[PDB]
Design a protein around this ligand. Sequence first.
Ligand SMILES: CC(C)CCC[C@@H](C)[C@H]1CC[C@H]2[C@@H]3CC=C4C[C@@H](O)CC[C@]4(C)[C@H]3CC[C@]12C
Ligand SMILES: *[C@@H]1O[C@H](CO)[C@@H](O)[C@H](O)[C@H]1NC(C)=O
Ligand SMILES: [Ca+2]
Ligand SMILES: [Ca+2]
Ligand SMILES: [Ca+2]
Ligand SMILES: [Ca+2]
Lengths: 187, 187, 614, 614, 48, 48
Amino acid sequence: SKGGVFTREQLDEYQDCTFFTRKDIIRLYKRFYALNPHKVPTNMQGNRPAITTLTFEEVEKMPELKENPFKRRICEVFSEDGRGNLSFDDFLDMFSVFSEMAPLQLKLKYAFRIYDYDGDELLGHDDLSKMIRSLTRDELSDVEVEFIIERIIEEADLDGDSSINFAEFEHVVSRSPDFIRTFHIRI
Amino acid sequence: SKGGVFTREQLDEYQDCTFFTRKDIIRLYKRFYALNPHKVPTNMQGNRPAITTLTFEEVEKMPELKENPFKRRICEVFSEDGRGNLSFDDFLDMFSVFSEMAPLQLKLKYAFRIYDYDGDELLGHDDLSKMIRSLTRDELSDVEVEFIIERIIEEADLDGDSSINFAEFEHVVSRSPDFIRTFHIRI
Amino acid sequence: SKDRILKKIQQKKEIIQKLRGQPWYMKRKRRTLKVAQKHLQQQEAKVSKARLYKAEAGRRLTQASRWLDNLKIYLIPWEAKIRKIESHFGSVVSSYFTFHRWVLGVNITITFIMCMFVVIPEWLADSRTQFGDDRYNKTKAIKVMPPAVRARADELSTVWDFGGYFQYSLLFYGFYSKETFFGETIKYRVPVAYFFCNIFILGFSLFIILRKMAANNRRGTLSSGKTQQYLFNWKAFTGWDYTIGNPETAGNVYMANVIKFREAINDDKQKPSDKHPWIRFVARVLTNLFICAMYVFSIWAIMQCGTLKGEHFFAQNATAITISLITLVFPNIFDLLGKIEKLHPRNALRFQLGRVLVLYILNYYTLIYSLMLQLEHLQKEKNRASLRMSQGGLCWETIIGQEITKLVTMDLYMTVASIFLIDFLRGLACRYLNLYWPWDLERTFPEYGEFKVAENVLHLVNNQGMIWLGLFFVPLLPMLNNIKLIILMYIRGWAAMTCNVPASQIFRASRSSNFFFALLILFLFLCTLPVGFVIASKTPSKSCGPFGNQSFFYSVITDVLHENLDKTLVNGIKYSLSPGIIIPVLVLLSLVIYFLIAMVTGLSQANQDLSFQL
Amino acid sequence: SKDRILKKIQQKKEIIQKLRGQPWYMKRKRRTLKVAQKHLQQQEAKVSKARLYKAEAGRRLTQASRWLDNLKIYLIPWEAKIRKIESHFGSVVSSYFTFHRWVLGVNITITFIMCMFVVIPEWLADSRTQFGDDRYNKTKAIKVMPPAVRARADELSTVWDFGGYFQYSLLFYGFYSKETFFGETIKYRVPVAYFFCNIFILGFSLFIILRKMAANNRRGTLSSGKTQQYLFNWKAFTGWDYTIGNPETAGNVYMANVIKFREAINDDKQKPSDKHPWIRFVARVLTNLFICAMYVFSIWAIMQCGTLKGEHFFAQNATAITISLITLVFPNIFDLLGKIEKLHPRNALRFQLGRVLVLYILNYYTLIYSLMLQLEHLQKEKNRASLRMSQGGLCWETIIGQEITKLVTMDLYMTVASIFLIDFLRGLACRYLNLYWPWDLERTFPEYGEFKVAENVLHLVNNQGMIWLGLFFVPLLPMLNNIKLIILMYIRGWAAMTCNVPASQIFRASRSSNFFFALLILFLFLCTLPVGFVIASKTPSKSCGPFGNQSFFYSVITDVLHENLDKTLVNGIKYSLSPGIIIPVLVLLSLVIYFLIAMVTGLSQANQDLSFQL
Amino acid sequence: DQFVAPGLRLWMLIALVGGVLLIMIVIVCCFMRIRIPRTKRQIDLIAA
Amino acid sequence: DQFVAPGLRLWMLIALVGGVLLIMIVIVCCFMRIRIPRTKRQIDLIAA
Ligand SMILES: CC(C)CCC[C@@H](C)[C@H]1CC[C@H]2[C@@H]3CC=C4C[C@@H](O)CC[C@]4(C)[C@H]3CC[C@]12C
Ligand SMILES: *[C@@H]1O[C@H](CO)[C@@H](O)[C@H](O)[C@H]1NC(C)=O
Ligand SMILES: [Ca+2]
Ligand SMILES: [Ca+2]
Ligand SMILES: [Ca+2]
Ligand SMILES: [Ca+2]
């Protein structure tokens, strides 16, 4: 199409480095600009895609992330810089990982990174507690949460480390018949 | 069925504890007596089956074992009391594990016990070395033997302990299509 | 040393290929791509000529493939519509619409095949025809309407029967001439194309469904999950649907997760109980007996309405109306009975799926039986009917095609009416009449409508199976079906957005994602069986259709082979097409599948024992 | 409260059975058995008297099963012979003899079925027949010799063709009357038994081979991962055969292990493969062309010896002699040409096995074609060979049976002669004349002789396939085959012990225990096609029973069904047995088998994984 | 048979008016985006 | 052509004598326990 916002080089690089076509990239740019037209420029030739940033709040207000309890975790995981704002490149990476055509291994790795609250590459007791209490809006009692955590941990505790590394998590969740269906964000 | 040398209770007990029928037990007794009639009694009723013993040399002279490189290892493995003797109960155990109808797990366990020369529950470096020496009549050079040992360890040792535990041995050898055929002694 | 350059080039190329799916930041991926492209440039220590031209061809081909994909991505419709539906409801609901779009694509492929190989050549023959032409002289019987039909063509009764202009059109089997060839040296015989196109379309539909199912199972999915020990992990790490956009659906997901976790920790392994022994089972038996009574009643009613005449606004359409009403009504009664059977919700949904599937199969075969009985009665009655016997005799193929088209159109109309009634009008009644009603119409029966994904999928597969059965007699059946599909799509989406409430829980009957395609395969087989029997047993109408005078339906290709090949080859073909060669294969297949079933039962028992041992 | 007691009792019962395979000394097994038995008998407050008697009956049934197993263990022949052969040569060689004994058992089962259901009733009817009896009145034509045949039966020419007392005996198809039955009501019709027994024997053979294959897979060898990751371990932990008793075979095993280990060290491109520039490829191409030439020569020779006439000692047996000579000679030529090809030893063995299999199949089908042509010629001849018309008409089924039994007997005779010459006389020559020959016979060419296990297995399977093919026309063919099998066994054993020498190195083309049974099912499938085609197409003779003067071979069953279920339902079956329905069933089986294979695949992998986790 | 032909057939006229009515209503529905069912908040807030 | 002996046929007599010879040689070979091939230790000595 027209493609005046990005050079052919930029679109080709994005296509070779992501799962999006030209149309998908243009639509994602339109959504990113509509999130905040003032900060996002009309044209993003050159280094601009990695420079322009939106605060985490400005990105979570979109409908695809508003109702997700892990919106903050997604934004923090995909943010290259930890100052609290997400750029357009990170936007594209986030919505390419959640796209339909992403492989199972990439989705598993990023889901493990999302659920890893403390960021120590292990799904510990507290990470599972926070995830469970977020999934049920804290309705479950403390004893029930502890029981669920213990049952989850004793599954895939091959190392006996009282925590789930990425190997055990991958081995377990790769056999889930519905992980690839839930872990999806269509845009 | 003559049923003279043994009692019905003894034969029933053996059939419960062994894969052999009455005919097989009688034939094995005939072979055991023919190995040395001067010390094996003509009648075996009561405790005598467990007390009449032949020296390891007298047992190895039978054709079924004299050509086997591991005949000494088989005799030592199946000797309940050791001390360079082998009773008739140990004889039946030995020729039952090697029978056609023995399960794969039992034969694997006893093969692991046979190849474990030092008797430390894991096939170490020296056990594999002497096993290769016996298998190739020491024709292979030292460097070749070391290379073969290293390859075997690298294939099987998934624990990084420089030795093959029975779990690793079971997992490796159960996939071999020749263990059932080779590990067999028809008698 | 020479192969080292090749190794480095291949490694850089595979790094470029695999870079698309790396868990790296965008800057890292761009830098690695730039470095790999620089090394692809450093490859200049490479042999020219054949290798250089091979590399150039590969680069050009991958650029062309990327351009083709970019052009293709613009042609996928309803992406926004499916996205909105998925955001409002979820992945399970949007799965039906994705399946609907896929079925529409398959139907479009079938329509393209039929048009290019059958319909368009016949249209070209008709257009090139002139008055007084020999081809016109010979096709006037089945192409030019007699004056009586011309006068009666515009009557509403004939339009309801798809007669008149519809009968004398490329829509039906009869209109196609048996004397149409488009080759001066090597003929492109239209009847041969017709037969082989129908057969190839059946085979190609089977191939497409199998290929899609394989691509959805393996080569793009997990293709795993044969165990059960990961219940808590699977319900915790897949407990949220990331496709949810509506807050109320999110709250429903929260409540469903709460219920599932409580059941797992307190009910699944702690407390089995019973309340009224020898009472609930009696109700179950009575309900099953009544459902069998409903089945036999449906069969009897289909037969009776097949026997009903009267040439009125309803007598001609009685069978289609009855079948459509049964299809749209009986599942609701089955759901109510499952409610009164107090069964487990997952088992209840499985029972509902099985019952609706059995109902569809029984209605299908009863319709076939009634059609054959009506054809036999009409043929014997030979020695309205005046319009039926217009094309030189009783063209029973055209009559069957007209009945199938009646079924399809009435199914569309009744589906539209049902959606307008039990979703829109029901929604309005529950919203505005709630304060006047003696009981709550929104928390008690009948609550706001819920999108029944499984029943809609079953209805869609039933429609596609009817298309498959009627395709031989109705060449343009998929094309009309295309319109139907499109309309259905929009209407369904509209209902979902305007009348339906997200379900409190989704106890999906099938864990696998290929269940819809499995049902499609089952219906494809159940529909290819009767048409195959008709081809192999039924004799075509004497003076109607692409076959006409010929003894059997397959006799045209047999004549072609006999005339264009030596006698011995055809004799060998006939010898190899004998029942004595196929039966031993069938017996061997049955015995080997019995042995495989025993082996897989043993393997499953071993797996269960290993899981229990832990 | 009794649940704990019954659970612990069941656990102890399970321990009773599991004790047989524990890695424990005999004292531990005795103590555990005594303790478990004391616990079992000691349990106070047992189950009710009805289930107490049920447990008593179960114990009695277990005792009876053990007693019958002990009785049966006495009926396994050649245990000593197979043990001696295995001790002298090894497990690979003794595998052929175990397979031979199993095939003998299968043939014995076939003979028992044929005798009990077909041969014995006919013999009883013949015995109860009297001179002047109505059955004698109507069976004198096909059961009583004319004086000419009675006089000429003593001649050796008639004995060669089985046309003497053999033709007028229970050995061949034509002797069985079509009027033989038992019972005033619900008759036991002998022709129906004949047909159903042939069909059931084919199906039962297929089922038995499948059951044996399933048992072999169940044994544990199926647990292979289809990977080479453990080549060193599989060459080290299975590097010795414990069945060896001969020191020379032990030394051969030592040398073979040395060679294998050194090769594995030097394989995987450590020693890159290199040969002559272009000579060996051209040699391989020329050898393949010459082998194809030998194939077409074998086909033409079978055809030419088929069209040979006269009453000479050789013209009658020309076809069987030619086929046997080809079968016993061409594999040797293939082995010799394998030296010219210079392939990988395992690959060379696989190629030779494939070539011999192709030769067997080609000879089988060429014999079918030649017998068909000869039958057509004899049928045209009418409007010593003429004496065959004494039975009444041609009785082409009896002619096929005589030809096939001549082939079987000649195969036996030529196999005995080949064993005597190639193995025994060559052994004596290499032992004694070696002092004089320029070539070292023992060392260079030819060696004393290695027992070709795979070639012997192929020969045995070919013989069994001939038995399957000729079973319809020769009911007693397996019985004679039994004798042949027994003789072969002994001779083969002798050829093993006195003439053959252990192989320097043992290679297996398949390395699977079901490969022989795979060849057996392949041959069964190939042989079941001509007989099925004959039943479905060929019309039976007008004079020789049990299908004399029938429209088809299956017309007896059709008449029986028509007389018993006059219901259209019979037509419905015919309706089913139709080309338009059996093809959808065939494609449905193809679609289901594919899915099934995959499931087991996946299940095995999962099991794989489960075990790994442990 | 109904009174059919005021020039064209009466069923044709009623079909035409029904078709234009359907086109108008589908246009309106496309441009409206209505939502009939109430949210659970609306359901339970008025239960009193 | 073989001719008929008193109450017997010539090929029948040949078959009888061949069969009894075969039975005798089979009986003898069932006890001989012969072994034709030489061992490698019995083969390598031929150099001298
Ligand atoms: C299965 C598919 C891919 C192959 C189908 C075969 C078709 C495409 C081939 C086979 C015979 C061919 C026809 C043979 C004769 C003529 C006559 C003239 O008008 C030229 C085109 C035309 C009409 C050819 C068009 C292409 C043709 C119809
Ligand atoms: C063809 O033409 C007429 C009927 O149209 C009929 O007499 C003749 O038997 C028919 N033959 C064939 C080939 O069907
Ligand atoms: Ca952590
Ligand atoms: Ca861990
Ligand atoms: Ca050790
Ligand atoms: Ca280890």
